[PDB]
Amino acid sequence: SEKLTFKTDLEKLEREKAAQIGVAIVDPQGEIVAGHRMAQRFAMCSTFKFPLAALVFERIDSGTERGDRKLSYGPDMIVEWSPATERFLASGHMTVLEAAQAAVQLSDNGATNLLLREIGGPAAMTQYFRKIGDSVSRLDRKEPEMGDNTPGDLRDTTTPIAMARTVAKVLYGGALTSTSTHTIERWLIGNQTGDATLRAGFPKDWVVGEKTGTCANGGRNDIGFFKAQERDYAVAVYTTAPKLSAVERDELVASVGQVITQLILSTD
Ligand SMILES: *C(=O)[C@H]([C@@H](C)O)[C@H]1CC(SCCNC=N)=C(C(=O)O)N1
Ligand code: NA
């Protein structure tokens, strides 16, 4: 059984790395391909920035937001890990689209907060999840405190299956116009923060786009999509490994990518 091998190999990683590994792989309609701890809650950390960009694109599509609108700010908006926001600070603004692209591709925290200050805060992010049929994911705080990942805390959490289904809805389920869908996919493919994580464990000819997270208490996450030949999949990986070094956590997620690959290749 290929799925048994998948389970066994993930459990071996968990045992040997003292880790918990949550995975869900779904088809474009949200049908389950495979998973592990798929309905256990994990901190979303920065992975929520992909749904945040989807919310922004939905508003742009609808006309309730404009991509070129300038969002002014001062140094009050700079928080830890805000590389683009810092570079644009002297100019005094970033556009909605600039901020969204920095949030997705650099995991820029200041840019994320700038967009949260606009779209209606964590309450509004959570309402977007509900609107697209995700009753599980919840944002309660802004960056970087939303990544505190206190054990057992249900604030700022999702489950692998809820998030994978949200990704599928956004990319394949008609949440966005064809243009906006294509754009967000290109942003995920061109992500600058994921070279050592999930995509490092996939075949080099798969088209892969993803959004990473790194948070306190050993959280290391990666969500997105992959196309294996003509077959599209949405995937969410959430891991907790407090005893591993940062480099080892990257390698753990890459290893999960390999386990996913073995399953997909072996099931034809
Ligand atoms: C998201 O998961 C966090 C946020 C909670 O702060 C950001 C920070 C990082 S890693 C920090 C070091 N980065 C570059 N030197 C990420 C990430 O995506 O890995 N997201
Ligand atoms: Na200020």
Cα–Cα dist 252/246, whole Å: 10
Q: Are 252 and 238 in contact (CB under 8 A)?
A: no
CATH number of 155's domain = 3.40.710.10
Between the CA of 205 and the centroid of ligand 1 the distance, in Å, is 27
- Residue range of the domain that includes 226: 1-268
Looking at all shown ligands, the one closest to residue 43's CA atom is: 1
Query: Is 46 a residue of the active site?
Result: yes
3-state helix, strand, coil in the chain (%, to 5): 50, 20, 35
Between the CA of 148 and the centroid of ligand 1 the distance, in Å, is 12
For residue 214, say whether it is annotated as part of any ligand binding site: yes
Query: Could you tell me the CA-to-CA distances from 143 to 52, 94, 133, 170, 223 in Å, in that order?
Result: 13, 18, 24, 23, 18
Give the active site residue among 1, 46, 180, 255. Answer: 46
Q: Are 208 and 197 in contact (CB under 8 A)?
A: no
Q: Experimental method used, please?
A: X-ray
Mutual orientation of helices 121-131 and 109-119 as an angle, nearest 10°?
80
Tokens encoding 203: 């075949």
Cα–Cα dist 191/182, whole Å: 14
CA neighbor of 221 nearest in space, from 256, 260, 267, 261: 256
Q: Are 143 and 109 in contact (CB under 8 A)?
A: yes
CB of residue 82 inside a 6 A radius of ligand 1: no
Q: What are the beta bridge partners of residue 43?
A: 157
Looking at all shown ligands, the one closest to residue 114's CA atom is: 2
How many other C-beta atoms lie within 10 A of the C-beta of residue 68? Answer: 9
Q: Virtual CA dihedral for 101, 103, 104, 106, nearest 10 degrees? A: 100
Q: Which residue's CA is the nearest one to ligand 1's atom 17?
A: 213
Resolution, expressed in angstroms to one decimal: 1.1
Number of domain units in the chain: 1
Between the CA of 78 and the centroid of ligand 2 the distance, in Å, is 9
